[PDB]
Curated annotation (Swiss-Prot):
GO cellular component, one term: protein-DNA complex
Protein name, per record: Serine/threonine-protein kinase toxin HipA
Key words, A-Z: Antibiotic resistance, ATP-binding, DNA-binding, Kinase, Nucleotide-binding, Phosphoprotein, Repressor, Serine/threonine-protein kinase, Toxin-antitoxin system, Transferase
Reactions it catalyzes: L-seryl-[protein] + ATP = O-phospho-L-seryl-[protein] + ADP + H(+); L-threonyl-[protein] + ATP = O-phospho-L-threonyl-[protein] + ADP + H(+)
Active-site residues (renumbered): D293 (proton acceptor)
Oligomeric form and interacting partners: Forms a HipA(2)HipB(2) heterotetramer which can interact with a single operator on DNA. When 2 operators are present each HipB dimer contacts 1 HipA molecule, which are brought together by the DNA bend and dimerize, blocking the HipA active site and inactivating its toxic activity. Mutations present in allele hipA7 (G22S and D291A) decrease the affinity of HipA for HipB.
Result of altering D275A: Retains toxicity and high persistence but not cold-sensitive. Loss of toxicity, high levels of persister cells and cold sensitivity, decreased affinity for HipB; in hipA7
Sites of Phosphoserine modification: S134
Function per UniProt: Toxic component of a type II toxin-antitoxin (TA) system, first identified by mutations that increase production of persister cells, a fraction of cells that are phenotypic variants not killed by antibiotics, which lead to multidrug tolerance. Persistence may be ultimately due to global remodeling of the persister cell's ribosomes. Phosphorylates Glu-tRNA-ligase (AC P04805, gltX, on 'Ser-239') in vivo. Phosphorylation of GltX prevents it from being charged, leading to an increase in uncharged tRNA(Glu).
Consequence the record notes for mutating D293Q: Loss of autophosphorylation; cells grow normally; protein can accumulate to high levels in E.coli
Entry binding sites for ATP: 136-141, 165, 218-220, 295-298, 315-316
């Protein structure tokens, strides 16, 4: 299989190919391995000489594309590719993927979009199909460059600064109707509550183009230089990749990594203490806001010079509370993607989970009890105000049902905190 030079911003990293036998390989650029400021494209693909044939090569690149066959078919369609295989895919849109793995078979420009043209691109992304927000597996992610107060499409190899998500819509199941038509407002809101609570998350703005409302989340794998002259891409990978696992096992119930393996893995981070504290805090947070899709691919690390790594901010944060009620799901069905320790097993029922459960997990993970307590205690006295602040800071066209669905359910859980801290 032909080549596609792998680039990290403006540096040649290596080359990728494939074989007709069904195998895949990658090779590092000798001058890359010779630089003192070199670093592996993936922790699962250690810096080395000679092509790499391990499955980690395919998995890494295969984790760069949506794990949904439905979604891939669309891409393979509007782009015409041999098949759904990574290469054919990345050989078309690998110019602005996740991280800094720019692929290509002289720039610094873009193209502003009219409000009419903006609504044109967004609409380009959008029957009858263990609850998970991404069950429809029919949500195509896109990106756009934001210059000032305008939305533009990067021109050339120019990077994007925002990840764009359109409404998931209502999912029709045989015995249930999942109302995720307000997933944009959901995440927007959830990202504000997370920030207000001191969590490391990106900022997000709701795009208004025509009658379609979308979510624009700043990419933390990008960064403007001091003179706003160049927009740099930053190396990054998710837990599946770093562990050399396929996206098919991102969930723990499917054999994927849980809280234990990641916490242990973070002990080798350049910010071990901080990263373990933050990760653990996000678990309590997910529980509080009813975030059920905290799978392995929902956590990533920044690859730094020398092969050192550290936790990246948290992302794709969506509450399941808004989907509660009527013909939808019920609290009793809300389960964390990564279970906690139980008296004689695991706890995943957000409804049957209390402070004691998090404290029990910390102890076994060797996470300072005094820290777990501080996390529980900190939410106990900040949640009440946090909610109101977020609210009194929301637009006027923001749906009450969403805030009510989240706030109430949040205060309902937060009660178990105050009555202990
Ligand atoms: N905001 C973000 N920044 C970088 N990578 C992302 N992946 C998903 N959301 C992201």
């Amino acid at each position: 299989m032909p080549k596609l030079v792998t680039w990290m911003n403006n540096q040649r990293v290596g080359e990728l190919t494939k074989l007709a036998n069904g195998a895949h390989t990658f090779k590092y650029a000798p001058e890359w391995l010779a630089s003192r400021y070199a670093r592996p494209l993936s922790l699962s693909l250690p810096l080395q000489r000679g092509n790499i044939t391990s499955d980690a090569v395919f998995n890494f690149f295969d984790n760069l594309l949506p794990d949904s066959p439905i979604v891939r078919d669309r891409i393979v369609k509007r782009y015409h590719a041999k098949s759904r295989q990574p290469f054919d895919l990345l050989s078309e849109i690998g110019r602005d993927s996740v991280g800094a793995v720019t692929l290509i078979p002289p720039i610094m420009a873009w193209e502003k979009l009219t409000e009419a043209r903006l609504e044109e691109v967004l609409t380009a992304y959008k029957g009858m199909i263990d609850f998970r927000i991404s069950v429809a597996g029919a949500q195509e992610k896109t990106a756009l460059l934001r210059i000032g107060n305008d939305w533009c499409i990067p021109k050339g190899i120019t990077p994007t600064t925002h990840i764009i998500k359109l409404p998931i819509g209502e999912i029709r199941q045989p015995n249930a109707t999942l109302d995720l038509s307000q997933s944009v407002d959901n995440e927007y809101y959830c990202l504000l509550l997370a920030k207000e609570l001191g969590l490391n998350v990106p900022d997000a703005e709701i795009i208004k183009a025509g009658n379609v409302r979308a979510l624009a989340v700043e990419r933390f794998d990008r960064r403007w230089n001091a003179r706003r002259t160049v927009l740099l891409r930053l190396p990054q990978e998710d837990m599946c990749q770093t562990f050399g696992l396929p996206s098919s096992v991102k969930y723990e119930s499917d054999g994927g990594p849980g809280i234990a393996r990641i916490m242990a893995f973070l002990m080798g981070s350049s910010e071990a203490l901080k990263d373990r504290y933050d990760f653990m805090k996000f678990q309590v947070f997910q529980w509080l806001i009813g975030a059920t899709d905290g799978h392995a691919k929902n956590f990533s690390v920044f690859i730094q010079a020398g092969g050192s790594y550290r936790l990246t901010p948290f992302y794709d944060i969506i509450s399941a509370f808004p989907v509660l009620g009527g013909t939808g799901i019920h609290i009793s069905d809300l389960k964390l993607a990564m279970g906690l320790n139980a008296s004689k097993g695991k706890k995943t029922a957000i409804d049957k989970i209390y402070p004691r459960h998090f404290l029990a997990t910390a102890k076994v993970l060797r996470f300072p009890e005094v820290q777990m307590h501080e996390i529980l205690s900190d939410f106990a006295r900040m949640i009440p105000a946090a909610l109101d602040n977020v609210k009194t800071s929301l637009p006027t066209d923001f749906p009450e049902n969403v805030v009510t669905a989240v706030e109430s359910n949040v205060l309902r859980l937060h009660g178990r905190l105050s009555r202990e801290y």
